Amino acid sequence: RLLLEGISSTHAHHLRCLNDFVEAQMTYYAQCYQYMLDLQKQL
Amino acid sequence: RLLLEGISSTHAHHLRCLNDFVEAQMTYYAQCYQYMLDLQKQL
């Protein structure tokens, strides 16, 4: 019973990690977008 | 020789096509960026 009780904290921990993954994708797309904009200007 | 002369026009046509591929990629990254932004706000 004691160990099974610890699972509750596991869920909240995983939630924080999910937020991190979302932020990473946002940064990736933002950087790529700016790079593409520059190429358009140069071409 | 006549067919070889045609390659000159091919390069100019190909250049316009390259510009189209660049435009397509820019749209993809732009749309994806907005989608990620919205998810961040909701969460």
Tokens of A15: 């939630």
Which letter does DSSP use for residue B4 in this model?
Answer: H
- Report yes or no: B29 and A29 within 8 Å, Cβ to Cβ: yes
Resolution in Å, one decimal, please: 3.9
Alpha carbon distance A35, B26 (integer Å): 9
Q: How was this structure determined?
A: cryo-EM
Find chain A residues with C-beta within 8 A of B25's C-beta: 36
Do B17 and A3 touch, CB atoms closer than 8 A? no
Q: Which two tokens stand for residue B34?
A: 């907005």
Residue B39 exposure: Cα atoms within 13 Å on the Cβ side? 15
Cα gap A14→B40, rounded to integer Å = 17
> Which of A19, A33, A43 minimises the CB distance to B29?
A33
